[PDB]
């Protein structure tokens, strides 16, 4: 009783933990009460209990600062007790730790400690270490003297001393700036999967000796460079306490035959001697490239040596080997066989939310101006990875320190802390950094939950409901499908005129379902066909399997048929190299992976009919041109980005644009906007888009689908009944 | 007690200021 | 195993391979198992190095030496018989071979039952439904599935009771049950290793699954079953058995089910 499992917290406050209500009732404490935490090696900490909707009953959520002072690690268990006799102090003495005060000088109390303690009412105990961020530094302090004991609340009316030399860090405590889990931004789902595999073998080895269950022995991380593969490996070892050893392909390859194998063996021997231990092998494809792809004897030998050492992990107790590669298929296939590196985690590229998190992490120490908008940056930084977002934060700080601080700074060892704390980075500083940086992963597909909602699609109310039944119902009501022997469809194909929102339909359902959206476009299907590299289709479906739950959207299914001449072309059939691989992968994909495949084409008469057979995209939805009320909704949605005059009659315009698609209604909106810009510019040689601008646009905009094509689309939909 | 709720009020203010 | 032999330097790999055969004779009767055969003796056209050619020749001579090394049988494991030096399959040596392949739905259930012998399963756990869902999985995948399901039960109950010590109480393990929710979770985290291969098994389609075509069903029995149920009648009257049949007509009328149904009744792959 009164024992809780230590886990991560969302509230980063140095004096707060979060409990689930059933434990607050068992301990007979209320929200805001002070408790004491009993850790390891006769160490304790004082904190305030709050609550949230994420903590489980058996867990206690705390940050790194509390775990460090308690000398506990994630996965351990501590005792908790109320202490209602807590009172405020009158005097405290807090001094910085030398390990974190570097490059700065001045009145550290006024810069850090006073903002930290003043009106903050924080519970502290003698000997506590806590971190205060600011001035582009992260400085931690120790409590060395208090009049009350052993703990008190620091009130705004207390006297805070800070006199004496900086204190050297003790061997019983770790630095709070050491790489941990709180330094990792995006790919939090991937980190959770790793923790599930790694925490128990290292934190609770007794479980795997006493219980007949096999541990993981290796994890392969893959994705573009700079995504956090090497950051995770270090953070895991530091959080769990395992001895960390670093291996990298180039360094091993820099050694002569016999030296490279000996050094690789020593790395494994050291991990066992210091077990529990984690070995990280970077550039796995460089140290162990596919043997069948190299004629060199030494390179084939080092692959055999690594495979032997990996198999030896059945004897080396409590040793886990992690590795990083750019592509999961660029390494010798033997490494990925059962055992060795049979478990893999897809790191990929951080999504818009993760990219913001990364920008926030690398600015925690930075002062940001009120005009700084890191969410807008995260949305614009397409193709960027964590290494690029960190570079953007540093480069933006370079402009802030050059523009303002360079006229304050000296050519000396340290800079005043007072002026650094007031150094705000502006929006123009991040914009400059964005123009100077170049995304390291712009060609690779970014897979994420889309931000398109149903409110972004004009009309199609019935199709929206149909997608919900196709994607959500099979898993929200599985007992009804079993009761009536219904086989859920594996996917749906959209057909009809262009410019009716087929792309948004697939994104909107992926968004509401909180599923990742994978977008395959014509150019990718054509590249595989033309280059005789249809094998890459397997990698596309493999992304869907790893990204699940997800929606796998194949756009422009006719892109190859049109590239083959479309209506005339050659004398052959609709089958080709790429569609054959796609159809094969579709048949090999089970609905149990929570992957739903959506197709779209504007020319269904020239696609391989096989894709419409049962087991494939056997659900067909016709998307006609928007009707009268839908066209109005489209015009209103498209104009949400511009000022529009009250005299603009969007219903009248929609009534005239009877043959226009949603894309053609956009052309009208864009033309009316450009006409408003033209007149506005001329007036200086206007504040809003007037009716005259839309009426003038009506004389330039045209429907993209001719009357002959509209009838063909309707007759095709009629033919399919 | 009251000194504990005073610490809680300050912790809640810091948390809500960051969330908003 | 391949890596253990191939990682050794010229002269060391051959000596170690020879010692393995010497020990098998000294301790005869003995079995030598060579895993990842294609790593030591790949098809000759795939390797040109002097070291790789010599170690292959050393294996070939050691295999031939088994005429004198009485009571020693050498078994080897490969992924494909066509990825290894064809010389190994000459009379003697590795002339006999057995296709292990992958388990079918019945075999997968048997594997799950074996790897759950020590597991306490809840009443909601049904390994037959799992075996039907685990398409493309091999025994090593089903073993991983059982392990992952056990880990979920451990996290939920073993950490919940707060048992942290050098040993684990047997009474706690006695009450530690693995529910179907833990298997479903493990299935989501498991990834079949044999999903790329063709699955060959006796189909579950029977004649009751096909509506109509009563005469076609009998015709398949005459073509497929009678040649082996009455082989003396085919010889007696000088019949030449047919090697196959083609179906034609509108699509979606049961052509596939007909082929499966006859394979099922005669229990053919
Ligand atoms: N996913 C991520 N989350 C947070 N920071 C990241 C992430 N990926 C990279 N970074 C940051 O970018 C830099 C990556 O450099 P490094 O650790 O050497 O990794 P790499 O292997 O990409 O060179 C570090 O400053 C790290 O903090
Ligand atoms: N019903 C609609 N609601 C909102 N926007 C639409 C609608 N129809 C078309 N659009 C706009 O037109 C553009 C083209 O849509 P898309 O599905 O890409 O057509 P296609 O696939 O034929 O090129 C989309 O980016 C979308 O913004
Ligand atoms: N005679 C029949 N009785 C029952 N079901 C049938 C019959 N003919 C076709 N079907 C149904 O139609 C589907 C397609 O049949 P199949 O033989 O696979 O087509 P094909 O042989 O042309 O590929 C089957 O899944 C089956 O359920």
Same domain? For A361 and A440 the reply is yes
Task: Could you list the residues of C known to form a binding site, using ranges.
Answer: 79, 115, 252-257
Mapping DSSP to helix (H, G, I), strand (E, B) and coil, where does residue C14 land?
helix
Interface touch B14/A13, C-beta < 8 Å: yes
Q: In the structure, do chain A and chain B come into contact, i.e. share 3 or more CB pairs under 8 Å? A: yes
| Strand order across the beta sheet in which A491-495 lies | A516-520, A550-554, A595-601, A491-495, A619-622
Cis peptide before A150 (omega within 30 of 0): yes
The secondary structure of C153-199 as a DSSP string is: HIIIIITTTT--SSS--HHHHHT--B-HHHHHHHHHH---SSTTSPP
Q: Which residue has the tokens 């007696």?
A: C236
What the block records as the tokens of C166 is: 């050098």
A505 phi/psi in degrees, rounded to 5: -60, -45
Which long-range contacts (C-beta less than 8 Å, at least 24 apart) are formed by C18-21? C18/C58, C18/C62, C21/C62, C21/C65, C21/C69, C21/C72
Answer whether A497 contacts ligand 2 (Cβ < 6 A). Answer: no
Indicate the helix (H) or strand (E) that contains A246. strand A243-248
For residue A282, the ligand 1 atom closest to its alpha carbon is 21
What distance in angstroms lies between residue A228's CA and the mean position of ligand 1's atoms? 5
Report the distance separating Cα A606 and Cα A559, nearest Å: 10
Same domain? For A514 and A455 the reply is yes
CA torsion sign for C245, C249, C254, C256 is: positive
The secondary structure of C198-232 as a DSSP string is: PP-------GGGS-S-HHHHHHHHHHHTHHHHSHH
Question: Cα A476–A481–A487 angle (5° rounding)?
Answer: 115
Strand duo A343-346 + A218-222: pairing: parallel
DSSP state, residue A132: E
Based on the structure, what is the number of domains in chain A?
Answer: 6
B-chain residues near A155 (CB < 8 A): 6
Q: How many other CB atoms are there within 10 angstroms of residue A483's CB atom?
A: 9
Among B1, B3, B11, whose Cβ lies nearest the Cβ of A13? B11
Contact A558, A603 (CB under 8 A): yes
Interface touch B7/A13, C-beta < 8 Å: no
Report the distance separating Cα C153 and Cα A649, nearest Å: 63
**Is A572 labeled as ligand-binding?**
no
Report the distance separating Cα B12 and Cα A117, nearest Å: 15
What the block records as the tokens of A125 is: 């105990």
N-terminal to C-terminal alpha carbon distance within chain B: 28
Q: How many residues make up chain B in this entry?
A: 20
Interface touch A77/C136, C-beta < 8 Å: no
Residue nearest atom 6 in ligand 1 by C-alpha distance: A386
DSSP state, residue A170: P
For residue C257, give Cα distances in angstroms to A497, C138, C155, C209, C212: 39, 26, 46, 8, 12
Contact C159, C216 (CB under 8 A): no
Answer whether C251 contacts ligand 3 (Cβ < 6 A). Answer: yes
**Is A498 labeled as ligand-binding?**
no
**Minimal CA separation from A520 to chain C, in Å:** 22
CATH value at residue A334:
3.40.50.300
Strand duo A129-134 + A277-282: pairing: unpaired
Same domain? For A621 and A545 the reply is yes
Mapping DSSP to helix (H, G, I), strand (E, B) and coil, where does residue C8 land?
coil
A-chain residues near B2 (CB < 8 A): none
Same domain? For A111 and A75 the reply is no
Interface touch C46/A207, C-beta < 8 Å: no
DSSP state, residue C51: H
Mutation choice for ligand 3 from C213, C217, C253, C261, CB with most ligand atoms inside 8 A: C253
Contact A271, A319 (CB under 8 A): yes
What distance in angstroms lies between residue C213's CA and the mean position of ligand 3's atoms? 12
Name the residue among A397, A355, A400, A362 with its Cα closest to residue A377. Answer: A355
What range defines the domain where residue A223 resides? 178-349
**Longest pairwise C-alpha distance within chain B:** 28
Same domain? For A483 and A570 the reply is yes
Strand duo A491-495 + A343-346: pairing: unpaired
Q: How many residues make up chain A in this entry?
A: 721
B-chain residues near A16 (CB < 8 A): 11, 15
Same domain? For A300 and A190 the reply is yes
Question: Cα A15–A19–A21 angle (5° rounding)?
Answer: 140
For residue A564, give Cα distances in angstroms to A556, A576, C49: 14, 10, 45
Interface touch C7/A590, C-beta < 8 Å: no
Same domain? For A371 and A288 the reply is no
Same domain? For A339 and A361 the reply is no
Q: Among the residues of A623-720, which ranges form H helices?
A: 628-638, 650-656, 662-682, 691-697, 707-719
Is residue A493 left, alpha or beta, with left meaning phi > 0 and alpha meaning psi from -120 to 50?
A: beta
C-chain residues near A214 (CB < 8 A): 143-144, 147
B-chain residues near A50 (CB < 8 A): 8, 11-12, 15
Residues 6+ apart with CB under 8 A from A247: A264, A267, A279, A280, A281, A282, A287
Residues 6+ apart with CB under 8 A from B3: A34, A86, A87, A88, A153
Question: Cα A423–A427–A430 angle (5° rounding)?
Answer: 90
What the block records as the tokens of A295 is: 């004629």
Contact A267, A279 (CB under 8 A): yes
Report the distance separating Cα A152 and Cα A148, nearest Å: 6
Report the distance separating Cα C163 and Cα C169, nearest Å: 8
| CA A265 to centroid of chain Cα atoms | 35
**Minimal CA separation from A167 to chain B, in Å:** 28
Strand duo A137-146 + A91-96: pairing: antiparallel
Answer whether A633 contacts ligand 1 (Cβ < 6 A). Answer: no
Q: Which residue has the tokens 């005792």?
A: A79
Same domain? For A372 and A307 the reply is no
Q: How many other CB atoms are there within 10 angstroms of residue A542's CB atom?
A: 15
CATH value at residue C127:
1.10.8.60
C69 phi/psi in degrees, rounded to 5: -80, 80
Contact A664, A704 (CB under 8 A): yes
Interface touch B11/A85, C-beta < 8 Å: no
Same domain? For A641 and A621 the reply is no
Mapping DSSP to helix (H, G, I), strand (E, B) and coil, where does residue C250 land?
coil
Q: How many residues make up chain C in this entry?
A: 269
DSSP state, residue C125: -
Residue nearest atom 26 in ligand 3 by C-alpha distance: C254
Q: Give residue numbers after which chain A breaks (C–N above 2.5 Å).
A: 685
Q: Which residue of C has its CA nearest to A292?
A: C46
**Is A326 labeled as ligand-binding?**
yes
* B11 reaches A (C-beta below 8 A): yes
Interface touch C168/A206, C-beta < 8 Å: yes
Q: In the structure, do chain B and chain C come into contact, i.e. share 3 or more CB pairs under 8 Å? A: no
Residues 6+ apart with CB under 8 A from A48: A15, A16, A17, A32, A33, A34, A35, A123, B4, B7, B8, B11
Q: Which residue of A has its CA nearest to C39?
A: A304
Residues 6+ apart with CB under 8 A from A348: A187, A223, A224, A227, A444, A446, A447, A547
Q: Which residue of A has its CA nearest to C149?
A: A213
Last-in-domain residue among A388, A409, A444: A444
What distance in angstroms lies between residue A536's CA and the mean position of ligand 1's atoms? 28
C-chain residues near A592 (CB < 8 A): 133, 187-188
Task: Could you list the residues of C known to form a binding site for ATP, using ranges.
Answer: 79, 115, 252-257
Is residue A2 left, alpha or beta, with left meaning phi > 0 and alpha meaning psi from -120 to 50?
A: left
Could you tell me if residue A415 is inside a domain? yes
Contact A158, A90 (CB under 8 A): yes
Last-in-domain residue among A420, A444, A468: A444
What distance in angstroms lies between residue A385's CA and the mean position of ligand 1's atoms? 8
Burial state string for A60-82 with b = 16 or more CB within 10 A and e = fewer than 16: bbbbbbbbbbbebbbbbbbebeb
Name the residue among A652, A16, A295, C163 with its Cα closest to residue B12. Answer: A16
Report the distance separating Cα C132 and Cα C108, nearest Å: 8
Cis peptide before C29 (omega within 30 of 0): yes
Could you tell me if residue A48 is inside a domain? yes
For residue C232, give Cα distances in angstroms to C94, C224, C227, C236, C266: 36, 15, 9, 6, 19
Last-in-domain residue among A60, A86, A112: A86
Q: How many other CB atoms are there within 10 angstroms of residue A293's CB atom?
A: 9
| CA A611 to centroid of chain Cα atoms | 33
DSSP state, residue C72: E
**Residue C259, CB-side half-sphere exposure with 13 Å CA sphere:** 9
Answer whether A325 contacts ligand 1 (Cβ < 6 A). Answer: no
Residues 6+ apart with CB under 8 A from C163: C169, C172
Answer whether C212 contacts ligand 3 (Cβ < 6 A). Answer: yes
Contact A48, A15 (CB under 8 A): yes
A-chain residues near C7 (CB < 8 A): 261, 301, 304-305, 307-308
Torsion of CA C257, C262, C264, C266, to 10 degrees: 180
Interface of chain A against chain C, CB under 8 Å? 3, 5, 58, 76-77, 193, 196, 200, 204, 206-207, 210-214, 258, 261, 292, 295, 297, 300-301, 303-305, 307-308, 311, 334, 338, 545, 548, 588, 590, 592-594
| A61 strand-pairing partners | A7, A18
A-chain residues near B4 (CB < 8 A): 32-34, 48, 84, 86, 153
* B17 reaches A (C-beta below 8 A): no
Same domain? For A209 and A277 the reply is yes
Name the residue among A502, A567, A558, A573 with its Cα closest to residue A526. Answer: A558
Same domain? For A513 and A500 the reply is yes
| Strand order across the beta sheet in which A159-161 lies | A129-134, A137-146, A91-96, A159-161
Mapping DSSP to helix (H, G, I), strand (E, B) and coil, where does residue A391 land?
helix
Q: Which residue of A has its CA nearest to C119?
A: A212
Among A301, A590, A593, whose Cβ lies nearest the Cβ of C7? A301
Name the residue among A516, A646, A551 with its Cα closest to residue A189. Answer: A516
Name which of A17, A48, A132 to mutate to probe chain B: the one with the most chain B Cβ atoms within 10 A of its Cβ: A48
Report the distance separating Cα C143 and Cα A275, nearest Å: 26
| A415 strand-pairing partners | A104
């Amino acid at each position: 009783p009164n024992r809780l499992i230590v886990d991560e917290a969302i509230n980063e406050d140095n004096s707060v933990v979060s409990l689930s209500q059933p434990k607050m009732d068992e301990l007979q404490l209320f929200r805001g009460d002070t408790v004491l935490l009993k850790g390891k090696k006769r160490r304790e900490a004082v904190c305030i209990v709050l609550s949230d909707d994420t903590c489980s009953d058996e867990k206690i959520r705390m940050n790194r600062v509390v775990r460090n002072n308690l000398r506990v690690r994630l996965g351990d268990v501590i005792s908790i007790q109320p202490c209602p006799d807590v009172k405020y102090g009158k005097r405290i003495h807090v001094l910085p730790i030398d390990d974190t005060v570097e490059g700065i000088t001045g009145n550290l109390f006024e810069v850090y400690l006073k903002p930290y303690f003043l009106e903050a009412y924080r519970p502290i105990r003698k000997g506590d270490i806590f971190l205060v961020r600011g001035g582009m530094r992260a400085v931690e302090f120790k409590v060395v003297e208090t009049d009350p004991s052993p703990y008190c609340i620091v009130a705004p009316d207390t006297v805070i001393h800070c006199e004496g030399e900086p204190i050297k860090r003790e061997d019983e405590e770790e630095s709070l700036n050491e790489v941990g889990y709180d330094d990792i931004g995006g790919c939090r789902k991937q980190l959770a999967q790793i923790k599930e595999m790694v925490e128990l073998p290292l934190r609770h080895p007794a479980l795997f000796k006493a219980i007949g269950v096999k541990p993981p022995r290796g994890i392969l991380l893959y994705g573009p460079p700079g995504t956090g593969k090497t950051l995770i490996a270090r953070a895991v070892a530091n959080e769990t306490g395992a001895f960390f050893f670093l291996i990298n392909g180039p360094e091993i390859m820099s050694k002569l035959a016999g030296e490279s194998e000996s050094n690789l063996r020593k790395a494994f021997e050291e991990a066992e001697k210091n077990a529990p231990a984690i070995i990280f092998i970077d550039e796995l494809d460089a140290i162990a490239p596919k043997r069948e792809k190299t004629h060199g004897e030494v390179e084939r030998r080092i692959v055999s040596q690594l495979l032997t050492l990996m198999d030896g992990l059945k004897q080396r107790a409590h040793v886990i080997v992690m590795a990083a590669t750019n592509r999961p298929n660029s390494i010798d296939p033997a490494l990925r066989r059962f055992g060795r590196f049979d478990r893999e985690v897809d790191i990929g590229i951080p999504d818009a939310t993760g990219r913001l998190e990364i920008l926030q992490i690398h600015t925690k120490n930075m002062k940001l101006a009120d005009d700084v908008d890191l969410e807008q940056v995260a949305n614009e930084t397409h193709g960027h990875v964590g290494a690029d977002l960190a570079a953007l934060c540093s480069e933006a700080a370079l402009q802030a320190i050059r523009k303002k601080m360079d006229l304050i700074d000296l050519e000396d060892e340290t800079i005043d802390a007072e002026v650094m704390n007031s150094l705000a980075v502006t929006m123009d500083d991040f914009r400059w950094a964005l123009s100077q940086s170049n995304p390291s992963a712009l060609r690779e597909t970014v897979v994420e939950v889309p931000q398109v909602t149903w409110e972004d699609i004009g009309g199609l109310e019935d199709v929206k409901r149909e997608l919900q039944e196709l994607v959500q119902y099979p898993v929200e009501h599985p007992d009804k499908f079993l009761k009536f022997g219904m086989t859920p469809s594996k996917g749906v194909l959209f057909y009809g005129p262009p410019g009716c929102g087929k792309t948004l339909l697939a994104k909107a359902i992926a968004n509401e379902c909180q599923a990742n959206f994978i977008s395959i476009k014509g150019p990718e299907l054509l590249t595989m066909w033309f280059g005789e590299s249809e094998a890459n289709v397997r990698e596309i479906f493999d992304k869907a399997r790893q990204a699940a739950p997800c929606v796998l959207f194949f756009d422009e299914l006719d892109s190859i048929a049109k590239a083959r001449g479309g209506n005339i072309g050659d004398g052959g059939g609709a089958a080709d190299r790429v569609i054959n691989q796609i159809l094969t992968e579709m048949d090999g994909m089970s609905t149990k992976k929570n992957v739903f495949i959506i197709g779209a084409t504007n020319r269904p008469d020239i696609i391989d009919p096989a894709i419409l057979r049962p087991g494939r995209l056997d659900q067909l939805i016709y998307i006609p041109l928007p009707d009268e009320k839908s066209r109005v909704a489209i015009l209103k949605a498209n104009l949400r980005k511009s000022p529009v005059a009250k005299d603009v009659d969007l219903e009248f315009l929609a009534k005239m644009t009877n043959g226009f698609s949603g894309a053609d209604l956009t052309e009208i909106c864009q033309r009316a906007c450009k006409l408003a810009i033209r007149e506005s510019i001329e007036s200086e040689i206007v504040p809003e888009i007037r009716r005259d601008h839309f009426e003038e646009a009506m004389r330039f905009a045209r429907r993209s689908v001719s009357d002959n094509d509209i009838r063909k689309y309707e007759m095709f939909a009629q033919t399919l009944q | 007690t009251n000194e504990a709720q005073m610490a809680a009020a300050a912790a809640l203010a810091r948390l809500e200021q960051k969330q908003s």
